[PDB]
Structures are given as C-alpha cells and as structure tokens.
C-alpha cells in the first residue's frame, strides 16, 4: 500500500489483467520507497479501514501480503467464466462489479476454509 499512511494506489487500472498483475508487483516495489480536526479524523478512519483490510488478510492466513493463494473451490455459480476469458478480456473494476453480489459469501467461505485448514494441521 502506497499512501502517507499506507494504502494501495491504482497502478494501471485500464490495463487488462495479464499486465496489471505485473504492475501490481511494480506498484509494490516503487510504493514502499515512495513512502485541523479534518486531517486527524480522516487519517484515524484511514487507520481503521486499513487495519480492517489487513485483518481480512489476517483471518485468511494471508498475514498482510499480496498474491496470497488459499484453498477454496471457486464455484461456477459465482462465475462460470474461463480463466483467460476474464484474464485477457477485462479489467479489474468491471470484474468487481460482476461479483459484488457475492463478496460477503466469498469472505464467508474463505473464513471457513482458513479455520478448517488450521484446525486440520492442528490435528496433524
């Protein structure tokens, strides 16, 4: 995340997926070396929303890191679309518009998968 307090910048929004992941990584590389009550109020809720989104990366085992892969069967009811179909014919904002009727259910399912994964290695 690229801000004075740290939060991601829109690196190359109009770029289609296959280049935009590369620019997400180069976003990271340049971003961390680039790093009256209105200002205080705004950056306190910036802290609050930041710690919120890092707790979403916290409770999926992702520990506050990008490109964090977890083990969920991505249902064809959420999207029947093929990989290269969306990953070379689309950008990211219209795909978030596509699946904004599922994001609470996706956070639901990744949380059962993370607690299931840690409870199973808690067994093993």
């Amino acid at each position: 995340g690229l801000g004075a307090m740290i939060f991601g910048f829109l690196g190359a929004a109009g770029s289609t997926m296959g280049a935009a992941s590369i620019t997400l990584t180069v976003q990271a590389r340049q971003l961390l070396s680039g790093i009256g009550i209105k200002q205080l109020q705004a950056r306190v809720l910036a802290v609050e929303r930041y710690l919120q989104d890092q707790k979403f990366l916290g409770l999926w085992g992702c520990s506050g890191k990008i490109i964090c892969c977890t083990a969920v069967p991505w249902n064809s009811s959420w999207s029947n679309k093929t990989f290269e179909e969306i990953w070379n014919n689309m950008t990211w904002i219209e795909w978030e518009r596509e699946i904004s009727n599922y994001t609470s259910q996706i956070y639901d399912i990744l949380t059962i998968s993370q607690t299931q994964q840690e409870k199973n290695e808690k067994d093993l």
Epitope: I93, E94, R97, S100
Partner: nanobody, 130 residues
Framework: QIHLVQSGTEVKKPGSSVTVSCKAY?????????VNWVRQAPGQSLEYIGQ??????????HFRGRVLISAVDLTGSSPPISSLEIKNLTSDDTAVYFC??????????????????????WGQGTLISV
C-alpha cells in the same frame, strides 16, 4: 424527476422513411445518461433495436446499415432529444417503438453493464403501421 415523451403515432407508406423523436424532460445530458430504442410488434414481445451511449451510435445486427439513430442533448429551448430513423419500412417494421434513458453515472449501481443496460424510464410507445 425524469420523464420521457416522443413523437405521436405515425402511419406511412411501404417504402417510406420514418423518424421518431425522443424528448427527455429530466435528463441532465446524454453524455452520462444513455438512451435505448426498442421495438414491439403487435402482441409479440418487445425487441431491442439500438442505443446511444456516450456518443457511440449502435444498432443491432438485425438493423446494421439500414436504421440510424441520432441524439442532441440539452440546449436552451430543447430538452435532450434522440431520434430513430428507418428507411424501407417493411410489413415487419409495423411495430410500437420506444425510447428509454438509463442513468450511467454511479458505475456500481447495476442498471448498466459495459454498453448494455437495464432500461430505467420509458415513454409512451409509438404505433407505426405499414
């Protein structure tokens, strides 16, 4: 609020050409709003024809190269007005026509999707007989 009217009911000759207006009393522009031209055969269900959407005129492959749509937005005496024009009205073109504006500003509302869109506020439908 938004309201739509258009031209009246016109009956013409086979092999004529027709134009149908679209006066949008409430559209702040047709830059951000988009309008849609939809036919309806007598009794038969409604069929899409064409649209204007950020000043890209389009019609269907059932209407490419024969039917033409225009739009001039908000001027002084005139509200934003589109217009559907058809040459060579066959007996198939005997239909009720429709103009409808959609709000395309807040991109995550879901009334629209990348050119195609759900049609917010209709007019009165115009009979055209051949």
């Amino acid at each position: 609020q938004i309201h739509l009217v258009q031209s009246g009911t016109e009956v013409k000759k086979p092999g004529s050409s027709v134009t149908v207006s679209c006066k949008a009393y409430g559209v702040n522009t047709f830059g951000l709003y988009a309008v849609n031209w939809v036919r309806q055969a007598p009794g038969q269900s409604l069929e899409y024809i064409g649209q204007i959407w950020r000043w890209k005129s389009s019609a269907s492959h059932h209407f490419r190269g024969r039917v033409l749509i225009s739009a001039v937005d908000l001027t002084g005496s005139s509200p934003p007005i589109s217009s559907l024009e058809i040459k060579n009205l066959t007996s198939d073109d005997t239909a009720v026509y429709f103009c409808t504006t959609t709000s395309t500003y807040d991109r995550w509302s879901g009334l629209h999707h990348d050119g195609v869109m759900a049609f917010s506020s209709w007019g009165q439908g115009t009979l055209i007989s051949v």
